[PDB]
C-alpha cells in the first residue's frame, strides 16, 4: 500500500505560487490531467488544502508530445531525507565510455502514495485572464519529480533490473530522479542493443521511455589554466599576465610574479613592447610548470552543496567551474555552443545549465546550485521555454560583473 | 442542505476562541434577539447549551440615517486560529481579456455564502452570546450552521461550492461562458437575446435547486452590463472615473479599502502607485484606528486621484489576429506602452517605472519593460505580443553581443518614434596605439576622511588633488574622472580599482551618484577609451608610482 513519509521536523508543506502559462501549455496540461484523473493517478481537491507547487509543460528533444513537469524543488527540500531509503551513487559511472539516459518516471505512477502525504503534492492548472478558478489536484501515486519517488520505488526497480544485471555484470545503472543512467564500455552498436534490451525489459516488466539521451563521460574535456606564448610582449600583455597569475596564486601558492612586475618599472605606454629579462623568462617558466599539475588534493565532500558558476565569453562560448570551497574547483569546462551565429543568449544559458547539471549527476550523484550571469526577471520570464530536463536545479543571480571572466578562457 | 460541506480544522496545536462578551444596552440586546430569532427560523444559526466553552464577541449597529439594527460578529480571534485555505483569487480578470459575445447577463451571487452549510464539527467554534439585560438570566447562546460573514474560510468555501454547482451546467452548455469574481457572475453566449434569456432561466433554476438564490424581480438596467466594475458594451468596454474618498483622518479600514481599490485599478489605469500608502497598516484594527498619512503617502494619494479622474476605454480580444505591443521612452525612467491588434484600437495602455537602483541605462530598462509586458500579456491572453520598439536593430545587436550577462528580447521590430534608445559610449577591446596612457589611483584616510586622487602618464603628465570628506571608493572614481578630463579624445586608463571597474563594466548611462554621472558625461565625449585593470601593490609601476603619491 504505502511506505510512511513525512516532512522535516517543524516544516509545513509548500505554498509556492503558480506562474503564468501560455494557452498552449494550459491546453496540454488539461488534456494530460484529465487522463491522469481518469487513470486514478490524481484527484481534484477542495479549498481546505492550502498547499501548492508550480506546474508547467515541456517537450523533449524529438517528441511532439507535451510532458507535465512539476517543480517540486520546495517540497523536495522540506521532505524528510529518507533513512530508516537512500539511493547510493556509483563512482564508476563517470569512468564509463558510454552512458545513456532513460526516462522511467512513468513506472512511479504504479505505486500508491501515503494517504496523509498526498495533500502536500497539490498543484493548480491556471486559467487564462483568471476568468475561472484554477483546477486543483493532488497525487494519489508517487509523482514524477519528487525525490521520494525513486527512493520508494528502489526495491521494485532492483527486482526489475536483476535479470539484466546478472547477465551484464559490468554495466553501471544509476537511478536519479525520474532518470536512469546506463553506462557500459561496449561499442555503440551492442551498447544500444543492451539499452533496447533494457527497454524491452521495462515494457515487459510492467510515454517517453522509447527516447534515449547518450553521453560520453570518458571524453569530457577539462580546462587547465594556460599562459600565452609570445615572441614580443607589450606592457598591456604583461599587465594582463600579472593579473592572471595573481589570480592563479590563490589556487596555487607557488606562483611568483615579482620578476614579471619588475618589467613594468616606470610609467610606459600600454602598447610599448618590453623585452623579457632572463629573470622574468625564468619566472614565467616556473609558473607555467606549476599550472600544468593539478590543484592540491581537492576532494568532493558529500555533506556540502556543489556550486556552479558560469561566464558568458561571447560568440556563443561559455565557461563554468564547479566547486564546494572557493579556489578548490572539482571541475572546470567550456562550451562551444550549438550555434555561434545563434541569436538567443538565454536559450544558450538554459542549455548550458542542463548540460552542467547532467555532468554533475553522473560525477557526484547530485545537482549543483547555480550562480547565473543574468537578471532574475529575464531568466524567470524565459527559461521554461527552453527546458527539456525532468529535474530542476537551484539557482541564484549574479548582478555584479566578475573579473575572473577573461581569466577563465 | 444539499450542498456537501468542506471539512475544516483549526491550526494544529491551537484551541477554539474564548473571548468575553462585552456588555450591551437593552436596545442593542433587544434587537439582537429579534435578529437572531429570525436567523434561527432560517436555519442560519442554532441555540446551544452551556457545554460549549467557546465564544466570540457579538455587536449590533444601526445604519446611517437609514435606521435598523444589524448583527456584527467579530471573528478576529477565530480567524487567527483557523487553518489556511486556498485563495481562489488575487488574479483579477482584465476586461480586454474577454472575447466578444452576442449576449451577456451579470448575475450577482453575493449572499450565496450565507446559504452554504458549515462543516458540522467546526460549528462549535463559532458560538456567540447575546448578553442578558440586568444580568438576571443566562445569556442566549447560538452557533452557526452556514458560512459566517467575516470568517476566514467563507470566501474560499463559498466560491468552491459555486464552482462545483456550475460544473454540470457548464458541461451541458459548452458554448456558454461563465466567469465568477466575488459577487458577480458573468454569463455570455452568442445566442439571440430570446434564447439567451431562456438559458439564464435554466441557470437560475439550477442554482435555486441547490439553495442558492439570485436577486429576483430584477434586471439591472439596459446596456452596458456592469461586471466587477467594468461597463461591458457590445464592442468596447469602459471603466468610469474612480472617485476616491476625500477626508480628514484616515483609519486602517478606510486605508485597506483604498489600497484594495487601487490594486484593482492598477491594471486598468497607468501610473497608479500604492506602495507608499502600503508601507503602513500592519498593527490592525478596522473601523477604529486612525493612522496619520505620511507626506509621501499624501503626494501619491493626490497623484492617484488625478489619474483616476479620467475614464478608460478599450476593445475586446480577437484570437484571430496578432497581439502587438508598442513602447515609448518618456524620460525620468518612465515608459509608456499600448497593446492592440488593430491600430488605434487599444486593448490595454500602461506605464512602466524604472526599478530602483543606483546605476542604470535605457537598454536595461527597455528590456525590463518588455519582460513585464510579456508576463502581463501571458496572464491576460495566454500569449506573447509582437513588439514595436524605439531602438535600432543594430544598437540591440551591439548591446547583447557585448554585454557580460545573457539577455534576450522576443520577436520585435524597430519603430522610429523619438526619443530613441541608444548606446552612449563603447569602451575599447584593446589598447589604443598613439593614445596617452594614464595610470590612476586614489586613497583616503578613514579616520580623518582626507584623501587624494591623481594620475601619472607616459608623457610625463601628472596630477594629484587633495580631497576632504571622502572615501577610498570615491577617490578611486575621482582619479578616473581626473584622467578623462585631462586627456585627449582617445585615452588608455589603468586602474587597480575593482569597484570602479565593476560600475563601468555594468555600462550605466545615468546614476544616483553625481561622481559616476560626471564620468559618464566624460565618456560620452571621448572617441576611444580603453580601461585596463591591474592588481594593487604588485610593483606594476605607473600604478605603484601614483599609488605612493596618493597615500600618506
Describe what this molecule looks like in 3D.
It is classed as transferase. Keywords: aids, reverse transcriptase, RNA-binding, RNA-directed DNA polymerase. It forms a dimeric assembly. The entry is titled "Crystal Structure of an engineered form of the HIV-1 Reverse Transcriptase, RT69A". The complex is a heterodimer of chains A (409) and B (552). Chain A is 29% helix and 18% strand. Chain A is of the alpha+beta class. Chain A has four domains: 1-85 and 109-149, HIV Type 1 Reverse Transcriptase, Chain A, domain 1, CATH 3.10.10; 86-108 and 150-224, Reverse transcriptase/Diguanylate cyclase domain (Alpha-Beta Plaits, 2-Layer Sandwich); 225-299, Reverse transcriptase/Diguanylate cyclase domain (Alpha-Beta Plaits), CATH 3.30.70; 300-409, Reverse transcriptase/Diguanylate cyclase domain (Alpha-Beta Plaits, 2-Layer Sandwich). In chain A, the strands form five sheets. Chain A has a five-stranded mixed β-sheet, with helices on one face. A four-stranded antiparallel β-sheet of chain A has the order 7-8-4-9. Chain A has a three-stranded antiparallel β-sheet with strand order 1-6-5, covered by helices on one side. By secondary structure, chain B is an alpha+beta fold. Chain B folds into five domains: 1-88 and 114-154, HIV Type 1 Reverse Transcriptase, Chain A, domain 1 (Roll), CATH 3.10.10.10; 89-113 and 155-223, Alpha-Beta Plaits (2-Layer Sandwich), CATH 3.30.70.270; 224-317, Reverse transcriptase/Diguanylate cyclase domain (Alpha-Beta Plaits, 2-Layer Sandwich); 318-424, 2-Layer Sandwich (Alpha-Beta Plaits), CATH 3.30.70.270; 425-552, 2-Layer Sandwich (Nucleotidyltransferase, domain 5). Helices cover 28% and strands 22% of the residues of chain B. Chain B contains twelve helices and 24 strands. In chain B, helix 9 (472-486) runs parallel beside helix 11 (514-525). Chain B starts with 25 loop residues before the first helix and ends with a helix.
